[PDB]
Design a binder for this molecule. Sequence first.
Ligand SMILES: C[C@@H]1CCN(C(=O)N2CCCC2)C[C@@H]1N(C)c1ncnc2[nH]ccc12
Length: 276
Amino acid sequence: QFEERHLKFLQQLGKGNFGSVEMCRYDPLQDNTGEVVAVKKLQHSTEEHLRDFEREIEILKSLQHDNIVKYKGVCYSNLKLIMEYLPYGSLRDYLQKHKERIDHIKLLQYTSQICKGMEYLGTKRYIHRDLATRNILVENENRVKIGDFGLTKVLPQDKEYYKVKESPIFWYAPESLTESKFSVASDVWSFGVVLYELFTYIEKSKSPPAEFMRMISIVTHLIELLKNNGRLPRPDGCPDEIYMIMTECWNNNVNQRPSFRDLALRVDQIRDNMAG
Ligand SMILES: C[C@@H]1CCN(C(=O)N2CCCC2)C[C@@H]1N(C)c1ncnc2[nH]ccc12
């Protein structure tokens, strides 16, 4: 496995409320030729949280896909999830830092890959629940991965939704805000928000919090706005078939939101029509 005594702390890669992600070297020969790894652990470790976490490792372990971050293992004395380390970091940071080299055709490459990732998730009846650029990783200039599964649930065998009561409320589907119900359709809502993020280049002045707050007890006010068909605006320069996808994803009716398989096709065609 991984002996935690050969696991060297290099640098803090992020902190997410109830969990941390660290860059570490696993170095059993103590000459720093050991492999650099990403290491996830809990921070205010709770009995319920540990169980959630042991459920999360199983999920990721079960997942094998070019656009899902690779499981490497676990380490125990203090339960730590071990994953491959991807230097380019989260898509959110990466976009802001290299956007001058990221054009619309490139954004649409990342988008398709996210959809394929999500296609594969639904193939296992997995609801991600935390779709946002902060959770997508950048492999190389031509590839992204879904890189965290902290809120991921498995749909009961009978149901098309999973119920669970801080939350990323400016990414949440209406029914998710009022009923705590999540689904592939709620994941499709959030994907639409991810698409928005992508097409605003993560500009602080254009963020879902920024825009909704300008439109706006905060969660209540927000429920009213979405009920009333208040929606994030079309990003500057955003193609009409792209804002179209976003608005379809943001359908109030759960049964009217597109499919990931359809989203992947349409995105791929938009991007191929743009190019040549
Ligand atoms: C983007 C990704 C998910 C979120 N995470 C994080 O901060 N959180 C998830 C749990 C709470 C906080 C950061 C993590 N980053 C930057 C990584 N960077 C490089 N290689 C990596 N391998 C595995 C993750 C990872």
